[PDB]
Amino acid sequence: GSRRASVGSHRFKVFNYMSPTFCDHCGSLLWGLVKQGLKCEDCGMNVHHKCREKVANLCEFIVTD
Amino acid sequence: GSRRASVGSHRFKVFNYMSPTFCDHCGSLLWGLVKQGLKCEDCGMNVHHKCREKVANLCEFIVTD
Ligand SMILES: [Zn+2]
Ligand SMILES: [Zn+2]
Ligand SMILES: [Zn+2]
Ligand SMILES: [Zn+2]
């Protein structure tokens, strides 16, 4: 048997973090109070703008529906 | 670039076909007027009861959402 996964590539979009949040790639704070980084619309990964270029494109998550 | 796909295993459920439908595995008619076979709830594959055991479990479809 198998889980069902949604498999694609990340879809990053600038996001307004309402509390201090860290880059899921590098571990440093997403600096500032607005538009601090990007959140993947599909899997929720948070990255610095600069880290968008560093992450693997692979985007998967378990579909728990 | 990558499509987004849902990737899992088939989820077959007995189905009552309304019009003449063929087995997606073997090509023979799904005989009868009721419960003629099974349809995968995820990808729509149609199979005879006897062909359920013959198909690969892999179930994928492109999510066009
Ligand atoms: Zn993602
Ligand atoms: Zn970072
Ligand atoms: Zn299927
Ligand atoms: Zn068949």
Short mmCIF file of C-alpha atoms and ligand atoms in Angstrom, two decimals:
data_model
loop_
_atom_site.label_atom_id
_atom_site.label_comp_id
_atom_site.label_asym_id
_atom_site.label_seq_id
_atom_site.Cartn_x
_atom_site.Cartn_y
_atom_site.Cartn_z
CA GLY A 1 0.00 0.00 0.00
CA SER A 2 0.99 3.62 -0.46
CA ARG A 3 0.29 7.06 0.83
CA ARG A 4 -1.00 9.46 -1.74
CA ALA A 5 1.28 12.36 -2.40
CA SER A 6 1.00 15.49 -4.42
CA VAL A 7 4.24 15.76 -6.39
CA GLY A 8 5.48 18.73 -8.40
CA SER A 9 7.82 21.69 -8.10
CA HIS A 10 7.61 24.51 -5.56
CA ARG A 11 5.37 27.50 -6.26
CA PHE A 12 6.82 30.32 -4.16
CA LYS A 13 4.91 33.54 -3.50
CA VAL A 14 5.89 36.51 -1.30
CA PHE A 15 4.25 36.16 2.11
CA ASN A 16 3.57 38.44 5.09
CA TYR A 17 4.71 36.58 8.20
CA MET A 18 2.72 37.72 11.24
CA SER A 19 5.29 36.48 13.74
CA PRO A 20 9.02 35.76 13.62
CA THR A 21 9.64 32.96 11.12
CA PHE A 22 12.81 31.26 9.93
CA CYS A 23 14.01 30.21 6.52
CA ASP A 24 13.36 26.48 6.04
CA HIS A 25 16.46 26.29 3.92
CA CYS A 26 19.19 28.15 5.81
CA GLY A 27 17.83 28.60 9.33
CA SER A 28 18.23 32.37 9.54
CA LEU A 29 15.38 34.70 10.49
CA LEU A 30 13.13 36.00 7.72
CA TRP A 31 14.05 39.61 8.54
CA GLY A 32 11.51 42.37 9.02
CA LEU A 33 7.78 42.71 9.64
CA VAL A 34 6.31 42.38 6.12
CA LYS A 35 7.11 40.57 2.85
CA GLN A 36 9.97 38.86 4.67
CA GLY A 37 10.26 35.90 2.33
CA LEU A 38 8.30 33.48 0.19
CA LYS A 39 5.97 30.66 1.07
CA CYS A 40 5.34 27.75 -1.26
CA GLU A 41 1.63 27.80 -2.14
CA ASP A 42 1.60 24.00 -2.25
CA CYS A 43 3.73 22.67 0.62
CA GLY A 44 4.22 25.70 2.89
CA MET A 45 8.03 25.87 2.70
CA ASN A 46 9.31 29.30 3.81
CA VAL A 47 12.44 30.77 2.17
CA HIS A 48 14.46 33.96 1.92
CA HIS A 49 14.38 35.50 -1.54
CA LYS A 50 18.06 34.53 -1.88
CA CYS A 51 17.33 30.96 -0.77
CA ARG A 52 14.70 30.46 -3.50
CA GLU A 53 17.66 29.81 -5.79
CA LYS A 54 19.27 27.33 -3.44
CA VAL A 55 16.47 24.87 -2.70
CA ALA A 56 15.69 21.76 -4.71
CA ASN A 57 12.63 22.24 -6.90
CA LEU A 58 11.00 19.03 -5.66
CA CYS A 59 7.76 19.76 -3.86
CA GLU A 60 5.81 16.94 -2.25
CA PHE A 61 3.24 16.55 0.48
CA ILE A 62 0.97 13.81 1.74
CA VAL A 63 -2.66 14.32 0.69
CA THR A 64 -4.56 13.64 3.91
CA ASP A 65 -8.08 13.93 2.49
CA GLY B 1 9.43 22.62 -14.77
CA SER B 2 7.14 19.83 -13.60
CA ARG B 3 3.47 18.98 -13.74
CA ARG B 4 1.82 18.41 -10.40
CA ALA B 5 0.70 14.83 -10.09
CA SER B 6 -1.23 12.91 -7.47
CA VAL B 7 0.72 9.70 -6.90
CA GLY B 8 -0.55 6.77 -4.85
CA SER B 9 -2.11 3.32 -5.20
CA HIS B 10 -5.47 2.57 -6.82
CA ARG B 11 -8.59 2.71 -4.66
CA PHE B 12 -11.03 0.42 -6.47
CA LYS B 13 -14.72 0.41 -5.54
CA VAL B 14 -17.54 -1.61 -7.11
CA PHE B 15 -19.30 0.56 -9.64
CA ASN B 16 -22.65 0.33 -11.39
CA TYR B 17 -22.04 1.27 -15.03
CA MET B 18 -24.83 3.08 -16.87
CA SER B 19 -23.68 2.39 -20.41
CA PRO B 20 -21.50 -0.28 -22.05
CA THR B 21 -18.00 0.08 -20.62
CA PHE B 22 -14.81 -1.87 -21.22
CA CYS B 23 -12.14 -3.12 -18.86
CA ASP B 24 -9.17 -0.73 -18.98
CA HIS B 25 -6.86 -3.68 -18.34
CA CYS B 26 -8.00 -6.47 -20.69
CA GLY B 27 -10.32 -4.72 -23.15
CA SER B 28 -13.34 -7.01 -22.67
CA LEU B 29 -16.80 -5.64 -21.92
CA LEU B 30 -17.71 -5.18 -18.26
CA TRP B 31 -20.64 -7.66 -18.47
CA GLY B 32 -23.96 -7.09 -16.76
CA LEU B 33 -26.28 -4.21 -15.97
CA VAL B 34 -25.11 -3.78 -12.35
CA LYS B 35 -21.85 -4.01 -10.37
CA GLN B 36 -20.11 -4.89 -13.60
CA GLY B 37 -16.68 -4.00 -12.30
CA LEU B 38 -14.64 -1.63 -10.17
CA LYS B 39 -13.74 2.00 -10.75
CA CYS B 40 -10.74 3.60 -9.09
CA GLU B 41 -12.01 6.46 -6.93
CA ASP B 42 -8.87 8.43 -7.67
CA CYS B 43 -8.01 8.00 -11.36
CA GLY B 44 -11.15 6.48 -12.84
CA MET B 45 -9.62 3.23 -14.10
CA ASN B 46 -12.30 0.60 -14.79
CA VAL B 47 -11.56 -3.11 -14.25
CA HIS B 48 -13.25 -6.50 -14.06
CA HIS B 49 -13.27 -8.02 -10.61
CA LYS B 50 -10.86 -10.66 -11.96
CA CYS B 51 -8.57 -7.98 -13.43
CA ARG B 52 -8.17 -6.13 -10.10
CA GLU B 53 -5.39 -8.60 -9.25
CA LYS B 54 -3.69 -8.19 -12.60
CA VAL B 55 -3.15 -4.42 -12.71
CA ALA B 56 -0.19 -2.60 -11.24
CA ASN B 57 -1.06 -0.76 -8.04
CA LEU B 58 0.48 2.54 -9.21
CA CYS B 59 -2.17 5.24 -9.51
CA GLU B 60 -1.21 8.63 -10.90
CA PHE B 61 -3.03 11.53 -12.46
CA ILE B 62 -2.19 15.11 -13.38
CA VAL B 63 -3.82 17.63 -11.05
CA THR B 64 -5.26 20.33 -13.31
CA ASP B 65 -6.52 22.44 -10.44
ZN ZN C 1 6.57 23.36 -2.19
ZN ZN C 2 17.46 31.37 3.88
ZN ZN C 3 -6.29 4.69 -9.74
ZN ZN C 4 -10.65 -7.16 -17.57
#
